[PDB]
Design a protein around this nucleic acid. Structure first.
Lengths: 129, 129, 129, 129, 129, 129
RNA sequence: AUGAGGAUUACCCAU
RNA sequence: AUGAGGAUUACCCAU
RNA sequence: AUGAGGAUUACCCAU
RNA sequence: AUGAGGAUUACCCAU
């Protein structure tokens, strides 16, 4: 066992899938990056700290790039037109059992399931109404 | 007893379970992540330290993704809308024996057991009433 | 009722029990140690005193060795990695009768009884949840 | 009963065993030393105090010497090339029953058992990985 | 998945091989050390970091000891008569793809291959001629 | 007899192999450069010198270019989009015999062997984890 | 009271 | 440039 | 002489 | 510690 393994970030049904792999663990921050130049890579980081005497806090971040080729000084460089950033913070009391935590995971999964309000809004450049 | 191993975080009874596996150990801070992009993964980190002369403190952090209307592998912004954060901090006096600690763990499991108030509130998007 | 005597600290049901026996009485501070080097022994000390005009206070300290991967009689450094420390301080008002005190002892036994939260937490390297 | 008795600190299977014996109890500090010149002896000390109103703290220390013969001013003296020090502090709430304490002892014993992670690392001049 | 593992630093067939094992990863600096006396051990450290806006930089260090015994006052200690210090810094622009990096590694391996100028000059206390 | 000769820096089988050839040896600094445009060439320099009374020190440098064509005003020139810079210093006491040096070289070759931590971390835009 | 602070005449140190 | 000048990280020194 | 200091006409910087 | 605060070298900002 070791949960620090590679995984499929973007699932495009076996073709053009974006898989992310472990790349660094310096300073207690777990990092995963897609197989690209550091300038065009997808990035995922995770860290856990004992925020309070009775809380533990997970800090998760994802970076989705819009890859492009830019000409600088007459030369072509692999670059990122822009990046989308996801920053999530999860605070869990120390009294939460494993089953209480499994509940939290399922909630986050249900939150983003296809067809549900939120992902439907995001995917359509809309708000909730 | 090497305890840094893979384990079931969200138990949906064999089918659709969420397994979290070791992914980083930088700075004695153990990390576990699910097989997802880091922006949509379930993340768990844990570390222990002597907070003061009389106490030891465990800091546990968990991150859970919102799943409803989630687009697997997609770029979902703002991050704060798609993630839940749990920060647990457990303070244990240096006088606590293994038995004392086992009792402390039971208190945590009981706090989160199915049907008890706290988890029933969280799950129903409610408070106490 | 001379109570300074040998007694079973860790009960593993007759076989593999850890007995602790009187080893020092300097300064009215009773001490008990297991039959080990002092760096790997189970140690227990107890003393009572009038903390203030209205209270009496018992100070109980226990030391427990980390046993997993322990080398009997070997030199294990750093000390702080191989030992657990328990500091108990019990304050009892001078008005407490023997009955009141018996009740206080039951509260302590109940707090640590098998299956209750606190010991269940400690034993599972967890907090409350 | 009196737990202040001699015991085998280093077990080398009946031959070359390092047994330690009671040597002092001044100032509430129980001391044991191996049968050597005070300059080359193994030393073990234990003391218990009521650290807080509700905690008891055991302070245990072991000293493992590397014996050598040094020539000073043209004369040979029994000496110690260097010493390894183990300092452990154990804090136990006053609410811990005897069985809760037996749990603590077993934990420390399991922690150092041959073959387990920690003693395996120490014995090999390595870290955990 | 982890690359912070044990590995062979010096390959002498399969007998006399020098192996370094992880020992510590504090402050983003990974450290490996060979077994036995830390005083006579081989050391290797590695760290990575964003030096500037477009460059990541690796700092790798190796220490080769000259194993010897020091005798002073008739007291002998295992020591290193002296040490050889290899210190290298590698800068890589964030535009480097994995292919580009693989090339950079082959350049380093080729630079030190048996028979080539640099490695054979060093192996003979010589310079270029 | 001479070691200031041509050699293979990058080994790609036998086709696409990068070869550097001597170019200049002024001021005790030996320099090798690959053929074609100096602008897109691989560079290697090496020098040795008595740093202190007991230490000799080698300073080796390698430059890996990213071959590209720059177009400005419709005028294209062969250039390097950027360069990777390897800079290493090796210190060796004057007490090192040829055997000691050979060991130091094997340590360097082992440090970069395929499959080992450092070389595989670099080859993947990653760090240690 | 806390330190994955240092040492070794049950001792210094920081907060 | 010279020294039957001195030393030893291809270096000081006198004229 | 040291830097997990920065770069890239064997070069700058801090101590 | 809190922000339906801002960004993107695990970083600034207000309270």
């Amino acid at each position: 066992a070791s949960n620090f393994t590679q995984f499929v970030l973007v699932d495009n049904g076996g073709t053009g899938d974006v898989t992310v792999a472990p790349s660094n663990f310096a300073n207690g921050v777990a990092e995963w990056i897609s197989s690209n130049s550091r300038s065009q890579a997808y990035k995922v980081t995770c860290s856990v700290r004992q925020s309070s005497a009775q809380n533990r806090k997970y800090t998760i971040k994802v970076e989705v790039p819009k890859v492009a080729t830019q000409t600088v000084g007459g030369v072509e460089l692999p670059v990122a037109a822009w990046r989308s950033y996801l920053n999530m913070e999860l605070t869990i009391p120390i009294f939460a059992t494993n089953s209480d935590c499994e509940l939290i995971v399922k909630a986050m999964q249900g939150l983003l399931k296809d067809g549900n309000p939120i992902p439907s809004a995001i995917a359509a450049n809309s708000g909730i109404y």
